RNA sequence: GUCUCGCCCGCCGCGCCGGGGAGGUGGAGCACGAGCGCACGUGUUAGGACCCGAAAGAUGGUGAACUAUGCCUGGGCAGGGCGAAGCCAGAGGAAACUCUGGUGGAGGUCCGUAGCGGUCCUGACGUGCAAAUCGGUCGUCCGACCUGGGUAUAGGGGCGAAAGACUAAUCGAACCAUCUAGUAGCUGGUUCCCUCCGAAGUUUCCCUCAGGAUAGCUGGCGCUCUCGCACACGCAGUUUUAUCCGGUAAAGCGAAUGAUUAGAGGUCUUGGGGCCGAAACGAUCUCAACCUAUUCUCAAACUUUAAAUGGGUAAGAAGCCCGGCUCGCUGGCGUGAGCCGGGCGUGGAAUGGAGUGCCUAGUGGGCCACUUUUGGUAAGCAGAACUGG
RNA sequence: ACUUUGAAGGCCGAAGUGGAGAAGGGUUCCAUGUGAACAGCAGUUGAACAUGGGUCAGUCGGUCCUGAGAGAUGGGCGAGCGCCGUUCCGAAGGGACGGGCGAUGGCCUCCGUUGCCCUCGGCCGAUCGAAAGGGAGUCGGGUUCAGAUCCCCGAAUCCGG
RNA sequence: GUUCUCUUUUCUUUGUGAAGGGCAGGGCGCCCUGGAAUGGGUUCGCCCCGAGAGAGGGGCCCGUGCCUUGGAAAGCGUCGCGGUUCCGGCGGCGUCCGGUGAGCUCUCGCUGGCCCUUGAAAAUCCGGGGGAGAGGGUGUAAAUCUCGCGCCGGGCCGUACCCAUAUCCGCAGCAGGUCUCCAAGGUGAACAGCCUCUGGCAUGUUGGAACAAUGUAGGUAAGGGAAGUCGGCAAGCCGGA
RNA sequence: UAGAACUGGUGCGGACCAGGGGAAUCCGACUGUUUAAUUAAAACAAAGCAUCGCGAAGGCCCGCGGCGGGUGUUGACGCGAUGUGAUUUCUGCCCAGUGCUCUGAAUGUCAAAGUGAAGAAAUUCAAUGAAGCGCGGGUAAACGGCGGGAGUAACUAUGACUCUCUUAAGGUAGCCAAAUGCCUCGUCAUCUAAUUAGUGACGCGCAUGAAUGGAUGAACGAGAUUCCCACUGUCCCUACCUACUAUCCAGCGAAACCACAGCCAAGGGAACGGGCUUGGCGGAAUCAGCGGGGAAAGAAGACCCUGUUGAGCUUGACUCUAGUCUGGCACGGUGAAGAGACAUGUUUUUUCACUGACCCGGUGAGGCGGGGGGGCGAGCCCCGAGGGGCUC
RNA sequence: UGGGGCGGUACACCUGUCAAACGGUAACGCAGGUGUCCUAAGGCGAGCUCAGGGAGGACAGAAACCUCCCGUGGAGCAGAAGGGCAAAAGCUCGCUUGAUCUUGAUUUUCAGUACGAAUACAGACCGUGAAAGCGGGGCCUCACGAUCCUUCUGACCUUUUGGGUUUUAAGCAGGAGGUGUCAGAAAAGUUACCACAGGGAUAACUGGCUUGUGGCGGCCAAGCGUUCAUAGCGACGUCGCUUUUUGAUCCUUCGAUGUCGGCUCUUCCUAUCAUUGUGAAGCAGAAUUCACCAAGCGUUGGAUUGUUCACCCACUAAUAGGGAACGUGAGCUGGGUUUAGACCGUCGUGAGACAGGUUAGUUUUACCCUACUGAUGAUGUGUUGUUGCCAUGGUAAUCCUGCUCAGUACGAGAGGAACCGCAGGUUCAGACAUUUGGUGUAUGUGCUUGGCUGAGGAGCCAAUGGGGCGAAGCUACCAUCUG
């Protein structure tokens, strides 16, 4: 046959990302003495729009504990913040919107964002537009804590992971329809080369296994085993249900 | 060498050494050696293999100056129509609000130039201006827009708003060189003369039916003999004299098997749309069949009978006769076969020189006519026997 | 008939059949002469043939910077020519400086200096990459068969020492 | 230039660079007094005001425009001289007043709208901040994020012409294709189409004679009006305000 | 810009510029894209709708190779993979078949290595026993599929009703002689002088039917069809005109093709001759045309057959393979509990904990653990109230 | 393989016939069979009689069982058919296991090779019979399979590698495990995106032979026709022609004969629709029906449909049938069919198929030879001219209406003709332009838009600026003349 689409994406060179106009990488500042034991202060300067994203980004400025210099960080913004706000980071912080502190000092039932998965990954989880995690249960024996994620899954992590307090800005976006095509075009043009999906049935059987026929039809069951090879692993993968 | 019955020998150490006869048998063997080397010719093969002839497969490499798509950075697009929110004023209303007149200038909106494209004329040209042009008529024209240059992706791979489309006039797998004189049961071609002999298209086997092997048909090279050499035997798409074989033509059914017509003597006899009647075998008919003697017609898969043409043997010296020997075979005594030694030549017609052995090519698609003959309405149709072309 | 000069009649109609340039071409440019060949007829003509001549910069462009991206070192992998990868498993800059120490040739005054002892040192990755992006500062007049923001005249200006 | 009749007529020509100094003119999200409703000011539109409007007086930026130095000597237009000529030659005049615009183009500013799009980086240069570090004596201090004036230099490579119905690619002087700048008069809504001036050309690889047939491109037709034909195919009607 | 008079042989957007309309059905919502050089379409795309996997030692994928690389300067309002196709109004039953998926020691089967008995030893035997296949559940906006006979209503005909045989269910709401109906030019109405056409109705539908999407319905279409008004040389029926040619002359000057050649009837023949046979007949060299023949030119017929010649594509053909699931040996170390088969200790094993090989992330490798010199303080003990012990 | 595919097996075997009297002999020729069955249905000996038919006998009947007579096979012998068999080869009883071990020869098919099957002998061991003798499978004709590999049986059997012993392995001889495509490969589809070497040894058009089917026509004559075989029809039967129907065949053509239908144009046939000249009726008149000579002149306008065919409207003397490579594509068109894209239904798991439907889709070349039409010229006559004759060839005129004859003849009536005459028309043909119309660049004369020659006048430019009237000429059943 011939190699198909999808099997061409994993090599890159035409399906790569478009990163000329992106401003940086969002991540929470590193761990150090002050943030481990005490706290530290910083100030917001401006709020900005990052392409390829829905969540706006803050700019925070800190005073370096060891040199006569200043140090800038590019956080992801909770909902409520503004310029001129003082932002306090670390263990001795007060529980209010915009600050950063650990999990095992928070109470139950509280909201967070830009959470960490392991202690010092600078922030990985719950960092999209309108989402938030939630604290559930502590365990001062063994230093563990459980967290609800926006997929509806309960997950265990430590009590030294850091996190940011509050929902994320951009909240409520998929409740606007797009109505046109060229609003989609300017969307994905800033992210990837991916938008027009040609249906497999309108192909020929060289370049897709569902292709061909005098009619348009699939001909075979659209579910497929997890361990099928590349080229055939298309459709409803490992489906344990179909319908609704 | 190999089975079957067997009685014996020699050896300083007797076995699980060695020897006879034959029912007999398996062998590319013996029996008074013929090869070895050199050259020439023909023939069958393996090699580029008489010459030219593919679609294709592998190894290694050049290409995105056309086109497909993504990114970087720069440029470009008359004049007009409809009139969304928002704003002002006047009038009405108890209020919420409403009516009328302006302003404003949004929109993958409308008409239309530049530009980008490419519907119809199924027009022109159709050895052209042109390996895809020209003319008028067309489509869209603030936007999923048009475009320059730079940069990324390379061949069972790339890119694709998908048509199996494009990838340097080439794409249902590019091009360049080599492997490579790839293979071909298949087409086309194969170079001077005279003489001589002179065919087949048929059998059996083959994943065989456009082809090969096998036998047959043909040629060449010989060799053993003999004759008008006063001096003979042997042969034959032939006739004759004797003698066997056959079941086809015709004929036959008052003879078997099978089929079939009609009336005379049988209610033979079952029963009657019924029959004169209580009906019966009292009668009286008959019918599907049915006893006796006769009658008309039939047979590729029936036959008592039985040709014409045909096939096979025989027509003498390898015969006849006389006498005697050998035999585990057979046995009243004897038969049979084999060996020995002697005596007796024309054995129906008409013809002519016979026999034997190696090498060996081309063929292996057939066709017609009398006569016989199968299928088919018939055929310049299809399939066979005889002879001749 | 076709060159040239004059006169007359006509077309292009400023999104041009006009005046200048990029890519590409490469002497085709300018004068004198020729009429074999070529210019699908002709030619006293020619972008043809022959012989000669012609492109002048502190200020116009390159050169400098980086862009998408390409690409060495260390390291890793690989039969092997080599390939991956660009801050990633690296003692990664010779960077400089104020002070002290003996020396230095010039009238060792002032120096740089080969040399150290000190002394502050991050950067964070060699290099390449656009004659349309970014990037100090020149204008008018005149002059040739053919050259001018370059030659001559006259008025200015940037950088460095 | 026209004048046979008219035409105070029609046509052409009628200027000052770079770099400075001064001033018009536009813009300000700049300051000082002062305290606003009977709410005011104000744009085509918007829009603004005790977080200080209107009204008064001030400051800053751009000032491609006018004046001035350049610079009238030079250039141009006319009427005349000399040099045989081999001449940037010599003279006499002039190089002037005003005005309108939904006018076209180029530019500078103000302001608003659209975006699940938010619209490059680096070389290089600059100012500020405690003064770190210090440095130097009444005539010194050397840097200097510098006042005016003589000085010295500024290397290498390209630069001719064509840029297209004849210098490029298409085998060719091929009706094809190939990125940009400048852009007048009239009609008209208009860079539509029709005629003209500046500048360019000789009809697009040849000419003369005559007007048969069939062609190709254009047109017109009495009366009827799709009866034609697979099919109103092609042509024709309507057409702007 | 609006109005009035007068004037012209009704001519007046006077040239150029410059929309034919109307009534209806089928498809696709629209704008957009598309087979360069025969197809611009009803085909692709879209917005909207719905499912599917995934919480990073991950999902999808690349790769000869590696602390390799893309999505990823990412984190479920996201990334990847699939089908339908705006809105409105709806989305019916079947888990028997096939696929997918969950668990599972409690059950057959099930390889290497390992365990044990016999043998002089190769060897043989036995017990053991992973994933997978079977055993069992869930799923149809997953591939897909969704029936026959007979009797029956006070005139006939129909047949609401009843019976019956089997299937995983036996076609629901809608719609139809359609771009889907063989029999077929189905039947009835209308349009027409006349209609195999077209519109509206009927429906035991060879073979319609529900995201393999059903039914509708404004605007748009270089889309496919029927009719009407105005219009016309499309036609009755052809004619006239103008330009460039063709034609003649001067000058320059090719090609394809070509056995030999070039008047007919009939006859026979490889059955349709320019040439043969029997008859007809036969007179130099040429000019403009036209298209009957030359079975006229081009391209070793793509239709059909054969070939023990090929290639593209698919799968339940045959033989294999990358990748991937799983068991075993090595890298593999420390300690502690529990329980075993033989036989009267052996190793085995399940579990818990450790770190030093190994792996991961972060950083300009910037303040780790104990300790009390700490002390601003607190609460717990002794407490000379002065001390030190504990929690911080 | 009477083209291939679907079907069948004529692909290994048996009987009868065809097959032409030895033997042998073909076709998808006729009729049928096989891939088995048997511890006896094999083998020896002995004894007996089959099918059926008749006559009798308690229940007893068409048929149970008993007895007698006739009985040439008319019954049986495993299966298909054929042959053969009576104190058997059949039925029944007794005993057994020649269905065993071993060489070689021959026959059948045939090359004169193999398998298989069969025959006659020889050596052994045996069985049955009193014994002669018979028996090494089934009364005869068919019932089955190589190398290589594996497994089993056998001999105090050879080798296992420098010698010896034991195990294993290899060898020798004989059975079995199997190839049905049966003298013996290990094996699924699709291509409309397709390709190559060849083929008229082989198909889809014409042509050619045949004429079943289709069409047309004769013979004899039972009945129809109230009566009356034959005015006109004609059963049951039978003899023929034609190639405008569809088949059968496969001779030419596969290095190419351009494949449906309409448009256009010419010629030919007759099996006569009408018109001319005539005959016959169940012909009073008028209309109609059968037939003869005859192919001269005619046979139309339209809705539907791609149409050939069909069907309806309207007029007409009439609305007849055919051909020529199923006339005619360097003459048109390209609607359909018959490439490439695509949509529905049915089938296939699927790529894909449909003899089902629907939409969009490149139609080349003449300047050669001939023929055909027109145009110059040529031979000879001494040269040249004027006037003329004729061979030979073509060939052209055709139909209808009206008034009169006449509301006459005829006929009961209703109704209803014709011959000569007069005037006019249709289709065709040949010229012509007095008059009407059309053309119009005489670029003739006015009018008018935009622009340009300073303006007026006179003029030009806009591939014929537009528009109005229009001479000569060319032209029309759209005007006229003639046959
Ligand atoms: Mg799609
Ligand atoms: Mg497709
Ligand atoms: Mg596939
Ligand atoms: Mg299906
Ligand atoms: Mg050879
Ligand atoms: Mg070759
Ligand atoms: Mg191969
Ligand atoms: Mg390139
Ligand atoms: Mg096209
Ligand atoms: Mg055309
Ligand atoms: Mg032509
Ligand atoms: Mg030309
Ligand atoms: Mg396709
Ligand atoms: Mg060769
Ligand atoms: Mg041959
Ligand atoms: Mg062959
Ligand atoms: Mg006979
Ligand atoms: Mg031979
Ligand atoms: Mg120029
Ligand atoms: Mg120019
Ligand atoms: Mg250039
Ligand atoms: Mg010339
Ligand atoms: Mg020149
Ligand atoms: Mg550089
Ligand atoms: Mg630049
Ligand atoms: Mg103020
Ligand atoms: Mg130049
Ligand atoms: Mg013009
Ligand atoms: Mg000329
Ligand atoms: Mg030219
Ligand atoms: Mg007319
Ligand atoms: Mg019509
Ligand atoms: Mg018609
Ligand atoms: Mg039209
Ligand atoms: Mg409908
Ligand atoms: Mg559409
Ligand atoms: Mg095309
Ligand atoms: Mg929807
Ligand atoms: Mg689905
Ligand atoms: Mg459903
Ligand atoms: Mg299931
Ligand atoms: Mg229904
Ligand atoms: Mg209908
Ligand atoms: Mg119609
Ligand atoms: Mg269905
Ligand atoms: Mg469907
Ligand atoms: Mg000519
Ligand atoms: Mg002839
Ligand atoms: Mg003939
Ligand atoms: Mg010929
Ligand atoms: Mg011809
Ligand atoms: Mg061929
Ligand atoms: Mg070929
Ligand atoms: Mg073969
Ligand atoms: Mg290939
Ligand atoms: Mg399989
Ligand atoms: Mg065959
Ligand atoms: Mg015979
Ligand atoms: Mg007996
Ligand atoms: Mg017997
Ligand atoms: Mg014996
Ligand atoms: Mg050994
Ligand atoms: Mg040994
Ligand atoms: Mg197809
Ligand atoms: Mg007949
Ligand atoms: Mg044929
Ligand atoms: Mg033939
Ligand atoms: Mg034949
Ligand atoms: Mg031809
Ligand atoms: Mg021809
Ligand atoms: Mg006749
Ligand atoms: Mg024809
Ligand atoms: Mg043609
Ligand atoms: Mg022709
Ligand atoms: Mg068509
Ligand atoms: Mg098609
Ligand atoms: Mg005559
Ligand atoms: Mg005028
Ligand atoms: Mg007129």
Short mmCIF file of C-alpha atoms (C1' of nucleotides) in Angstrom, two decimals, chain F residues 35-153:
data_model
loop_
_atom_site.label_atom_id
_atom_site.label_comp_id
_atom_site.label_asym_id
_atom_site.label_seq_id
_atom_site.Cartn_x
_atom_site.Cartn_y
_atom_site.Cartn_z
"C1'" G F 35 -14.75 -46.75 -5.76
"C1'" U F 36 -18.41 -51.88 -2.64
"C1'" C F 37 -20.07 -56.86 -0.32
"C1'" C F 38 -18.70 -62.19 1.86
"C1'" U F 39 -16.01 -67.16 8.12
"C1'" A F 40 -19.26 -68.00 3.88
"C1'" A F 41 -22.01 -66.11 -0.67
"C1'" G F 42 -14.48 -69.68 -0.25
"C1'" G F 43 -13.17 -75.11 -0.82
"C1'" C F 44 -14.28 -80.89 -1.07
"C1'" G F 45 -18.28 -84.95 -0.78
"C1'" A F 46 -23.33 -86.77 -0.66
"C1'" G F 47 -28.56 -86.25 -1.51
"C1'" C F 48 -32.62 -83.42 -4.06
"C1'" U F 49 -35.25 -80.15 -7.48
"C1'" C F 50 -36.82 -74.45 -9.88
"C1'" A F 51 -40.79 -70.69 -11.89
"C1'" G F 52 -45.61 -71.52 -12.52
"C1'" G F 53 -50.44 -74.27 -14.05
"C1'" G F 54 -54.37 -77.92 -12.83
"C1'" A F 55 -57.51 -81.24 -9.19
"C1'" G F 56 -58.57 -82.33 -4.27
"C1'" G F 57 -58.58 -81.68 1.63
"C1'" A F 58 -62.32 -79.36 8.91
"C1'" C F 59 -62.55 -73.58 10.35
"C1'" A F 60 -59.36 -71.86 5.17
"C1'" G F 61 -61.30 -67.04 2.39
"C1'" A F 62 -57.57 -64.48 -4.12
"C1'" A F 63 -53.10 -66.02 -0.62
"C1'" A F 64 -51.12 -69.99 5.64
"C1'" C F 65 -50.51 -76.01 5.67
"C1'" C F 66 -51.00 -81.49 3.34
"C1'" U F 67 -51.03 -84.74 -1.28
"C1'" C F 68 -50.92 -86.08 -6.65
"C1'" C F 69 -50.02 -84.87 -12.00
"C1'" C F 70 -47.76 -81.57 -16.08
"C1'" G F 71 -43.39 -78.74 -15.95
"C1'" U F 72 -36.07 -77.62 -21.24
"C1'" G F 73 -35.14 -74.19 -17.39
"C1'" G F 74 -40.12 -69.92 -18.81
"C1'" A F 75 -36.43 -69.68 -11.47
"C1'" G F 76 -32.00 -68.75 -8.89
"C1'" C F 77 -26.30 -67.96 -8.96
"C1'" A F 78 -24.76 -60.13 -3.82
"C1'" G F 79 -24.56 -55.75 -7.48
"C1'" A F 80 -25.19 -53.01 -14.17
"C1'" A F 81 -25.86 -55.74 -18.52
"C1'" G F 82 -24.29 -59.78 -21.45
"C1'" G F 83 -22.85 -65.08 -21.90
"C1'" G F 84 -22.98 -70.11 -19.34
"C1'" C F 85 -25.24 -74.08 -15.84
"C1'" A F 86 -30.32 -79.67 -14.42
"C1'" A F 87 -28.81 -86.72 -10.50
"C1'" A F 88 -25.15 -78.24 -12.00
"C1'" A F 89 -22.26 -73.67 -11.36
"C1'" G F 90 -28.84 -73.87 -8.21
"C1'" C F 91 -31.45 -75.83 -2.57
"C1'" U F 92 -30.12 -78.49 1.74
"C1'" C F 93 -26.59 -81.27 5.14
"C1'" G F 94 -21.28 -83.23 7.01
"C1'" C F 95 -15.99 -81.75 7.43
"C1'" U F 96 -12.78 -77.74 7.10
"C1'" U F 97 -9.68 -73.02 6.15
"C1'" G F 98 -5.53 -73.73 -1.38
"C1'" A F 99 -8.27 -66.44 0.74
"C1'" U F 100 -1.18 -70.25 3.06
"C1'" C F 101 4.80 -70.53 1.79
"C1'" U F 102 8.48 -69.89 -3.21
"C1'" U F 103 11.11 -69.24 -7.95
"C1'" G F 104 10.66 -68.33 -13.10
"C1'" A F 105 7.45 -68.43 -18.12
"C1'" U F 106 2.93 -66.42 -20.96
"C1'" U F 107 -1.56 -63.38 -22.10
"C1'" U F 108 -4.51 -58.72 -21.92
"C1'" U F 109 -3.71 -52.53 -22.77
"C1'" C F 110 0.80 -51.73 -25.49
"C1'" A F 111 6.33 -48.78 -27.31
"C1'" G F 112 5.60 -54.18 -27.66
"C1'" U F 113 7.18 -50.55 -21.19
"C1'" A F 114 4.98 -50.52 -16.02
"C1'" C F 115 0.53 -51.07 -12.54
"C1'" G F 116 -3.63 -54.16 -12.10
"C1'" A F 117 -6.26 -58.56 -13.55
"C1'" A F 118 -5.87 -63.53 -15.50
"C1'" U F 119 -3.72 -68.58 -17.32
"C1'" A F 120 -0.92 -73.06 -17.63
"C1'" C F 121 3.35 -75.61 -15.04
"C1'" A F 122 7.18 -77.05 -11.01
"C1'" G F 123 8.75 -77.53 -5.62
"C1'" A F 124 6.52 -77.68 -0.31
"C1'" C F 125 2.72 -78.12 3.57
"C1'" C F 126 -2.34 -79.36 3.66
"C1'" G F 127 -7.99 -80.14 3.55
"C1'" U F 128 -11.80 -83.17 1.76
"C1'" G F 129 -13.36 -87.75 -0.49
"C1'" A F 130 -14.26 -95.24 -0.84
"C1'" A F 131 -11.10 -93.58 -4.69
"C1'" A F 132 -10.21 -91.41 -9.39
"C1'" G F 133 -9.42 -86.61 -8.34
"C1'" C F 134 -10.36 -81.48 -7.10
"C1'" G F 135 -8.75 -76.82 -4.54
"C1'" G F 136 -3.18 -72.16 -4.22
"C1'" G F 137 -10.43 -66.84 -3.20
"C1'" G F 138 -15.80 -65.21 -5.17
"C1'" C F 139 -18.88 -69.30 -12.69
"C1'" C F 140 -16.40 -65.49 -16.73
"C1'" U F 141 -16.29 -60.46 -18.17
"C1'" C F 142 -14.60 -54.15 -13.76
"C1'" A F 143 -13.84 -53.35 -8.24
"C1'" C F 144 -7.71 -50.03 -8.02
"C1'" G F 145 -2.02 -46.69 -7.18
"C1'" A F 146 5.55 -45.30 -8.44
"C1'" U F 147 10.19 -43.04 -6.38
"C1'" C F 148 11.51 -40.26 -1.37
"C1'" C F 149 9.86 -40.78 3.92
"C1'" U F 150 7.72 -43.45 8.18
"C1'" U F 151 5.99 -48.16 10.86
"C1'" C F 152 5.80 -53.62 11.50
"C1'" U F 153 7.72 -58.86 10.57
#
